[PDB]
RNA sequence: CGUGAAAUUGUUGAAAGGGAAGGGCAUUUGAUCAGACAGGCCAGCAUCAGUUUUGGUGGCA
RNA sequence: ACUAAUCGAACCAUCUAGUAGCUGGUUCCUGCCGAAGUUUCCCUCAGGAUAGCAGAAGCUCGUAUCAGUUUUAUGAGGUA
RNA sequence: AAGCGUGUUACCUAUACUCUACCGUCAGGGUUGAUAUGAUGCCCUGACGAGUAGGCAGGCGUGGAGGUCAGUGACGAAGCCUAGACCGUAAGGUCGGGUCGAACGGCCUCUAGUGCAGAUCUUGGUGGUAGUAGCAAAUAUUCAAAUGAGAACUUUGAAG
RNA sequence: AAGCGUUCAUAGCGACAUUGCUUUUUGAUUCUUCGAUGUCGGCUCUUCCUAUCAUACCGAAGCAGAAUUCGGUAAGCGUUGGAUUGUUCACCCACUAAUAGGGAACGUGAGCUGGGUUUAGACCGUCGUGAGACAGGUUAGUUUUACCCUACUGAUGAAU
RNA sequence: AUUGCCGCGAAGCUACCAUCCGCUGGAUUAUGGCUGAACGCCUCUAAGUCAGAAUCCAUGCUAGAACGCGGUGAUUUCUUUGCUCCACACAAUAUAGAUGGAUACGAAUAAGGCGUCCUUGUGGCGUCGCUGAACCAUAGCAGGCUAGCAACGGUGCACUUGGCGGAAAGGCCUUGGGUGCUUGCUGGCGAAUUGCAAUGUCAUUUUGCGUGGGGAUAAAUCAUUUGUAUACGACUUAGA
């Protein structure tokens, strides 16, 4: 008979299967539509998630009880050093989908990207791209021929970039390589831009700007095998329940004589690819700048890094994107930040944001000091030997 | 008599063409069907869209991935019709189905190959004048086929190159016909004409 | 005999996921390997060319024990012993019937070919 | 510890294998096997007979 | 309730292969023939006896006596 | 229309119908002064063949008994194995090859504790399950030496 | 469609008749199960139906506005918290956009629970000479097994 | 003192008990319309057609076919002389089934193709179809040897010039000469006995093996290690 009391289903059926993503680098499944009028630009950018901290800012939102009044907002910092352009790929249109016709690499590849082509780098002869780089020998005729093919064909052009992971407090040493669609100009202009940028670095301030709404594409934090209670949010069974209570009591009616695909069951939780959208950029900071953490109202000559460093990450020596709120994935996780897929004019977007203050107290405890000098002023002198 | 028979699917009725090809395959003739997107189904577009939606709603309840697969592309809608006219769970049916290729548009190497029609299955011949009919391209797009635009663009490109080839062929055919007409009324031609040639 | 064994990366080299480290079996086999080797160079066979040409395990008769179960029931608690044998060997280093037509065709090919 | 079956099992060899397997009729392929030259095997044509099937044409009411 | 893991009459042996209109099983091949679930009676209604349907053995004769049929003639009937 | 009503033909195929053969059954016949010795024999002619329960008939197989083959057999009986062979519609029978070691058959008759897939069948043997469930109460073990083929577990010392 | 509806059959209704649909009611049957398909209700959880309570877009009104009512497409999305009762059912309080109706072996007991029925103890009332009876009341009363196959959820993986 | 108890307690986990974030296009239903006959009027409907729902399909999001696919990197000798390509030589392996040629406009069908001319068009005129029953090819020991005539064509094979073709291009078009054949025509010679028929063997696939001719000179896994991962596998890092 009928359910006897209506309740919404537990969990979303479109985020299925709740399995481990095939890679730690979540893949961009859609790039922004290409306006051939605008200049040639990258559509995404690669960064590493560092941590989170709070900001204070005035709120420009008429009609709200907090208009022109300060608010405290959590933000996520992503360490985004420049990425190196090391390749270009041409994509032709086909009645079966998009097909990569050919890929042209730069003459020189760094070790951090050459590592990405090895599983056992210390034992290897490091032969990668050795014969390819001889196609630049006399005048790069083969390189120019392949580029000409991309000019002729290739309705879509994506540039191959890799991160400079050596500029990060990460032990990995092996760079992340990704295809970033290249929007703007003709196909020929896209190829010319990519060729001009081989071996060249592209900064994050040439791709993103403050107040822009962006999307985060990253693999979520893993939790291994999870029971249905926390994996799906189902009700905990009563206390008197024989043979366990962190379960679903009925996994199905008698007919169909099968368990439905839509029944909540235990399995892998986390480590899922997620594409979260509409995250407002609060700051595009430059690493070669003391006072990253400073604002126009603070003037405290401090960088974005918290005292004692970002917990489990380290210090931010590079450029960085400060984005409102939380993004999927954990610290150290490679994240792709992508430009908005649509023009958002919701008046939460288009709101110019001006930070009044950035918290840099320790995140290794209940940190009560923004800077060591502020700590010295409050504490006074101590006994620790000079 | 051909080793491979290429059927232009334009303006054919899907089920009557399907039965023809199914008999050809089972009788051992290799068939390639091109321009699947230009196939016709008798009846209004709404009727055939309603029929596909009725087809869409049937799926294995407990796992939709083990159910009736609903292929959206026109060549696959043709293939599904041709299955069910072929005993496809047998080895003989598998060997019959391996003699068939169905494409949207005309890809290489069939661009420069003769396309035939099946008058037995042509809409212009079978269907009563005034009867409403559906085109499989717009049906496929309405049910989720993604590649109508790329197919149309590539077909325009193929048609342009083909028209240019035909202009050269027509010019040579003109010259050949003139030389054969001039050779007529000669002694060898008159003897040939007395033999029906 | 692997149903509900655990999975290991050490099965990779054999194209499998289920592999174990049966120390007692290995000790018994390597004891027999030692004996057969001793026999081989006792016979005069060369060491470096020896390979295991035959190795066979058979069920020996079972040794019976008992195990005590709930509600005063007794069940068998059996050993499954083995007969093992192995051999090590040195590695070692149509008239056609033709008919008259077929014969004539062969002759015809020979007089029109050279 | 005579012989030493079956169930069940190891090894070797052969073979087949997209949600069972096994079976019937028929034939292909592989493997394997019997007998006969004092007619054994497989066929072809002709003239007939029995039973049929499909054409051509003639004479009458 | 308990009376040795046994209790609305323990346990052991024998009478005892206790009786069962009820359940289960009932072991080679081929050939020919080939059913009944209906009549009457029965503390009869899950069973029997009885007649019928069936097989087998034949016997007395040798194309009759006949006949799930019609025709002709002649009855009878109270349903549509 | 490959839909509906209707009409016309052609065509497809049942273990049914026609003809032929072979098997069997039933029936009706033929055949003795050599039937060119099988008279429960041989031969001629016609028709017939579904089958539970059940009836009957002719056969096949097993233990033992009388008779016979002056049968087989340590130069290998019986038993067992054998995608080797042959006969019979079949029950079955026979032969080859391997194993084996001491007895056993054919035919005419006699006799029965005489033929198994089933009985939650009896006894015994054996699988899949499966190297699976498990070997988780009683707070707890550790270092070294000695012994020994082998020591988490034995001994001694130290310690907890 | 006789009437009601201020006049006006059909805005909204609708007598006398009459045609159906449904299988969440209950009867009727006794086909399946008695070498056993776990038995009421609740809990949990998924999905389906539409005869749509709410939300979308609409048509009609005895639609001025507001509030309502009748009707369409439509099941995409929701459809609650409680007092008493084992309850199904019900009833009241309250919130709400709304507190629509049903199915899935009267979905779901190797998922639970065990208040109910329906074992054995015991009391009462009526009945019975009595033993005892009661779809009458009351109280106490063991809820077993998954490691197999499939399905499902996740996880490896030969061959290219 | 089976974590003795109490206060605080970082890290991790975690809460509508915390914070962030949850897209925009098409086609439709009901309905309302347009033009408009049927039915000289009317009519949202018949042919055409507009707008239009929490509907549907896409965009977007999740997985990625473990028998769907593409691009790209490097591919093992001083190592029982290995690997790869090419060529020719023999072996083996098979065949969902060669047996003259898969012979390319596009569009309409109540219309078209071809040709011709002009005033280059939705043009004039002529002509065609009513099937490929076509066109092409096609004679020669399964196609031999050899002599000429006529023409300078046809066709094969390699070498070669240039151009085009990315949907799955892997093919199409050409240039130049060379080396063959030519049945366009006329000759001379050969064939027999496979016995009156027996596919009477002529094809294209795969893998070996040998020879001679170019070419290149790695990784992966286990073990160790990390913890962005984790039941185990797996994942993700590091290590001359
Ligand atoms: Mg409901
Ligand atoms: Mg309990
Ligand atoms: Mg975050
Ligand atoms: Mg912290
Ligand atoms: Mg299915
Ligand atoms: Mg064509
Ligand atoms: Mg889809
Ligand atoms: Mg286990
Ligand atoms: Mg025990
Ligand atoms: Mg013995
Ligand atoms: Mg013995
Ligand atoms: Mg056996
Ligand atoms: Mg399988
Ligand atoms: Mg079969
Ligand atoms: Mg004849
Ligand atoms: Mg008894
Ligand atoms: Mg009969
Ligand atoms: Mg009586
Ligand atoms: Mg009975
Ligand atoms: Mg009467
Ligand atoms: Mg009467
Ligand atoms: Mg008809
Ligand atoms: Mg019979
Ligand atoms: Mg005997
Ligand atoms: Mg013997
Ligand atoms: Mg056998
Ligand atoms: Mg003896
Ligand atoms: Mg007996
Ligand atoms: Mg038995
Ligand atoms: Mg039986
Ligand atoms: Mg275990
Ligand atoms: Mg049961
Ligand atoms: Mg409805
Ligand atoms: Mg129920
Ligand atoms: Mg239970
Ligand atoms: Mg259950
Ligand atoms: Mg109770
Ligand atoms: Mg289990
Ligand atoms: Mg369980
Ligand atoms: Mg109008
Ligand atoms: Mg995806
Ligand atoms: Mg894959």
mmCIF file of C-alpha atoms (C1' of nucleotides) in Angstrom, chain E residues 13-71:
data_model
loop_
_atom_site.group_PDB
_atom_site.id
_atom_site.type_symbol
_atom_site.label_atom_id
_atom_site.label_comp_id
_atom_site.label_asym_id
_atom_site.label_seq_id
_atom_site.Cartn_x
_atom_site.Cartn_y
_atom_site.Cartn_z
ATOM 1 C "C1'" A E 13 12.238 -55.247 26.975
ATOM 2 C "C1'" U E 14 8.579 -58.224 24.945
ATOM 3 C "C1'" C E 15 3.453 -59.101 22.846
ATOM 4 C "C1'" U E 16 5.123 -56.643 17.735
ATOM 5 C "C1'" A E 17 6.611 -57.049 11.199
ATOM 6 C "C1'" G E 18 0.433 -54.227 16.449
ATOM 7 C "C1'" U E 19 -3.895 -52.110 12.682
ATOM 8 C "C1'" A E 20 -4.237 -48.229 8.887
ATOM 9 C "C1'" G E 21 -10.553 -46.982 3.957
ATOM 10 C "C1'" C E 22 -4.359 -42.656 4.586
ATOM 11 C "C1'" U E 23 1.116 -40.738 2.487
ATOM 12 C "C1'" G E 24 5.479 -42.440 -0.083
ATOM 13 C "C1'" G E 25 7.988 -46.136 -3.133
ATOM 14 C "C1'" U E 26 7.231 -50.555 -6.005
ATOM 15 C "C1'" U E 27 13.528 -52.695 -10.368
ATOM 16 C "C1'" C E 28 14.382 -55.422 -18.209
ATOM 17 C "C1'" C E 29 12.690 -54.820 -23.688
ATOM 18 C "C1'" U E 30 9.558 -55.002 -27.639
ATOM 19 C "C1'" G E 31 4.623 -56.424 -29.825
ATOM 20 C "C1'" C E 32 -0.965 -56.503 -29.901
ATOM 21 C "C1'" C E 33 -5.477 -54.972 -27.574
ATOM 22 C "C1'" G E 34 -7.181 -51.082 -24.584
ATOM 23 C "C1'" A E 35 -10.432 -48.143 -20.123
ATOM 24 C "C1'" A E 36 -13.224 -45.584 -15.949
ATOM 25 C "C1'" G E 37 -14.641 -41.419 -12.963
ATOM 26 C "C1'" U E 38 -21.334 -43.766 -14.409
ATOM 27 C "C1'" U E 39 -26.024 -47.687 -12.074
ATOM 28 C "C1'" U E 40 -27.763 -49.947 -7.258
ATOM 29 C "C1'" C E 41 -26.639 -51.018 -2.117
ATOM 30 C "C1'" C E 42 -23.579 -50.064 2.181
ATOM 31 C "C1'" C E 43 -22.244 -45.826 9.822
ATOM 32 C "C1'" U E 44 -21.880 -45.002 2.571
ATOM 33 C "C1'" C E 45 -19.373 -39.427 0.787
ATOM 34 C "C1'" A E 46 -10.640 -40.153 0.534
ATOM 35 C "C1'" G E 47 -13.573 -47.016 1.038
ATOM 36 C "C1'" G E 48 -16.025 -51.297 -0.806
ATOM 37 C "C1'" A E 49 -19.680 -54.711 -3.222
ATOM 38 C "C1'" U E 50 -22.570 -54.578 -7.847
ATOM 39 C "C1'" A E 51 -23.370 -53.671 -13.195
ATOM 40 C "C1'" G E 52 -20.911 -51.239 -17.107
ATOM 41 C "C1'" C E 53 -16.434 -50.060 -20.027
ATOM 42 C "C1'" A E 54 -11.375 -53.781 -20.903
ATOM 43 C "C1'" G E 55 -8.161 -58.013 -21.888
ATOM 44 C "C1'" A E 56 -7.477 -63.059 -22.333
ATOM 45 C "C1'" A E 57 -9.166 -67.930 -23.456
ATOM 46 C "C1'" G E 58 -11.760 -69.738 -26.689
ATOM 47 C "C1'" C E 59 -16.181 -72.499 -28.580
ATOM 48 C "C1'" U E 60 -20.538 -73.343 -32.285
ATOM 49 C "C1'" C E 61 -20.951 -72.316 -36.984
ATOM 50 C "C1'" G E 62 -19.576 -69.824 -42.123
ATOM 51 C "C1'" U E 63 -22.339 -64.411 -44.589
ATOM 52 C "C1'" A E 64 -26.324 -65.410 -41.239
ATOM 53 C "C1'" U E 65 -28.479 -62.788 -36.852
ATOM 54 C "C1'" C E 66 -27.829 -58.079 -38.128
ATOM 55 C "C1'" A E 67 -27.164 -52.169 -38.035
ATOM 56 C "C1'" G E 68 -25.746 -45.375 -32.972
ATOM 57 C "C1'" U E 69 -28.294 -45.008 -41.199
ATOM 58 C "C1'" U E 70 -32.173 -43.999 -44.458
ATOM 59 C "C1'" U E 71 -36.963 -45.093 -47.116
#
